[PDB]
Every structure is written in C-alpha cells, then in structure tokens.
C-alpha cells in the first residue's frame, strides 16, 4: 500500500534522522533535524539503537507532509521499509507502515554514518549527548 521514490521529491522537506542508545542503561534518544531548520529529540526508555533509528523515522514521518525525503544511516530500517511489508510482528513497525501508506510520495535515502554528512551529523550530535 506504498512504495518509495527513486529520487528526492522537488519541493519535498528533508529530515535527517538518527538514533542513540545506551548499551548498559537501556537509554535512548531518537529525533530529526530538517534543511528548513525544523527539529524534534524525543527520550525513550529500555531500548536499542535499531529501535531508535525506526522510532527517529516514525517522528519524521509524524512531522512531515504528505511528501517526504528522509536520511538515515540505519542499514537496519531501510531493509524493513525497503522491502515493503504489509504488517510486522513489531508495533512500531506497524505504526511507521500506516505512516507510508498515508503519505503521497516517500523517499528514503541511506547515509553512512559519522562521514561528515551535514545534515547526519547535525542529528547525530543531538541524539548522542547524553548518551
Ligand atoms: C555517537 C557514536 O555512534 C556511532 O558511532 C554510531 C554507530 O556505531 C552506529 C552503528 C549502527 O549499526 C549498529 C547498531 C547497533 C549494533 N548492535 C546491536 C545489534 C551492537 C552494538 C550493531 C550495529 C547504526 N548506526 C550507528 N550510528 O548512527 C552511530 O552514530
Ligand atoms: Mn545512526
Ligand atoms: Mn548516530
């Protein structure tokens, strides 16, 4: 019930996305930072970094209009939303799949992380302090 585009949408608003857990504490921050200076870090509890960076791309989802270029540097999260499934086992996977079917135009883009891309960065920073 969606598909994603093979290039950035003109016009589209980009977000940055990106994710941090603690290892030890089970602490998290997940959030987005946007080329229109719009951003948002959200705290989670008892989590993973995988979790993170989908919960990351369900914020920018949440935020965002019906057309969207999202980056994130989770190979994890692309292969979910990548392969188009019509319902996970997971709740959270659930919530971002009705997310995508809402909007008009999707495109997710990977980047590696903590290779002086901007905008990745930008969000990296913000998500990582403090954790
Ligand atoms: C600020 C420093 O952060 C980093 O250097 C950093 C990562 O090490 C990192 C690792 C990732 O992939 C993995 C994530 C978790 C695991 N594990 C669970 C299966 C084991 C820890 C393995 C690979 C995915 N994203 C990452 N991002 O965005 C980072 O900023
Ligand atoms: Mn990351
Ligand atoms: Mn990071």
Redesign the pocket.
Known sequence: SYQLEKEPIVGAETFYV????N?ETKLGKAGYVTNKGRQKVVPLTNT???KT?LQAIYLALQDSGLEVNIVT????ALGIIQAQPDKSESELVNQIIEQLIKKEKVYLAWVP??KGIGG?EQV?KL??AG?
């Open positions: 990106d994710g941090a857990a290892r993973t970094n995988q960076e540097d989770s190979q994890y992380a903590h990745n990296d998500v990582s954790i």
